[PDB]
Amino acid sequence: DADGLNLGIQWANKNAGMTQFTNSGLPISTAIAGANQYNKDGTISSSLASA
Amino acid sequence: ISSQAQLEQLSSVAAGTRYLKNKCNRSDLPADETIYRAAVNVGKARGWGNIDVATLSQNSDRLYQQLLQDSTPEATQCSQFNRQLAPFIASLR
Amino acid sequence: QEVPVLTTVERKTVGIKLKVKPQINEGDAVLLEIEQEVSSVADSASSTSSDLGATFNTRTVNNAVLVGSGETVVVGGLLDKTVTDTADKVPLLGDIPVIGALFRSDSKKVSKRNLMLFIRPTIIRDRDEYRQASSGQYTAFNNAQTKQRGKESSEASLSNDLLHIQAFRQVSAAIDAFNL
Amino acid sequence: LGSFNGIAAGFYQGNWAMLLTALSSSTKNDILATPSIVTLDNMQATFNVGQEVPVLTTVERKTVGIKLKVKPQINEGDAVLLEIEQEVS
Amino acid sequence: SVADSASSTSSDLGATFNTRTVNNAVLVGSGETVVVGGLLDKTVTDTADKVPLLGDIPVIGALFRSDSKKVSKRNLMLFIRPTIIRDRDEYRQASSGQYTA
């Protein structure tokens, strides 16, 4: 038997800092690159993080 | 397959119950006629067509002879039956 | 099953290899230099370097013991937990537990394990003693067999007719039919 | 940036800039191993759990686990002798 | 037998060779059903995962768990039975009857 748990948040602001956590499975890099690429292209492009 | 399996099942329990009474010291069991009436009552409770008592008696006799002539040790027969005619006994009491 | 490794290669077996050596000493006592293993292969993901692809999970026991005839005996045992924790937080922060909980980042996990071994012999002298052991044990089989799916079985039933040792086979059968 | 962890705060007032950088990290690990066995005195029993993996020495079989083996000698009414060896790998 | 639905063949030797192998010695009476060897075994495993703090109301929260469960049961039984045969007569019954079987 094996049990496991995790928990964590992250923050971002153009004028402010950056709170990243890689253990989580997804950086903010996934986000800043997800939405500016999204709304730049209009929609999803496979260039985004395959994670 | 309509009137044969019903007769064989009732004849089998009546023959085995008589065996138990006569050969396995089951003195709590009633007389042969009462055992025959109890086997008829099992058929009636199941909604079975009326089974002739004398046809049941004749068949049951034949099965009782088969239990008696069997080359099976008595001890084994009595134990086997006593555990096979258990529910039946309950119905007849 | 059996699977080959590259040592050009040879045959390799993975299963439950239980072998023993029984010595009857006293009226009732026995001696058992037993050894065995329950092995399998997992390979969710493992180290195969395009060479020999194999994990061969195994547990292997061997020893010698004196045991009474009809007895449950503890041979070998293992029980183990394993915990690990991972934390990281911006310094000086997260310190107010109710409030600051918004800056920690937590990953915790555990693993527990246990393993138990039991053996039990029985002496058998002659035919009589044999019948109970076989018949009863076989019943232990039919218990789980007929436990879920209720099917009629030519082999099993017939085999029982063997373990029993012609009219009795008719009447007991008929009674069985009736009580369905 | 794909690997960074922690915080850093962006500031700009004309000509200057500054970046604060910090992080805290910790890690904790535990284990426990309780095996048990029986045997006679003079004959050795041995015991092991764990997987098995091959190295390239063409290669051979290698085991990784908890190989606990001993040799019990009963001397006095109550005393014993244990030439034990084992490893948790 | 050989199964090979999917197995470890590394372009070397492709084989599984499922097997069960018995050997022993026994004393047995002439006409007798004899239990030689036996195995019976079940094997269960479970897999669960859920967003924490949720799924806790069984009737309601059942909408967040994600469940995969499976079992395997197994059993194996071995029986032997000899018969002695002295001469022609004893032979006829054994052959004829068996052939009828």
Residue numbers in the entry:
A (entry chain B): 354 to 404
B (entry chain R): 39 to 131
C (entry chain B): 455 to 461, 474 to 631, 638 to 652
D (entry chain A): 405 to 461, 474 to 505
E (entry chain C): 506 to 606
Task: Please give me the paper's original passages concerning this structure.
The protein GspD forms a 15-fold rotationally symmetric pore termed the secretin that inserts into the outer membrane (OM) and provides a conduit for substrate into the external environment. The T2SS from the human pathogen K. pneumoniae HS11286 strain comprises 13 genes in a single unidirectional operon termed PulC through to PulO. Note that Pul and Gsp nomenclature relate to equivalent proteins in homologous T2SS systems. In this study, the T2SS outer membrane components PulD and PulS are co-purified with the core components of the IM AP including PulC, PulE, PulL, PulM and PulN.
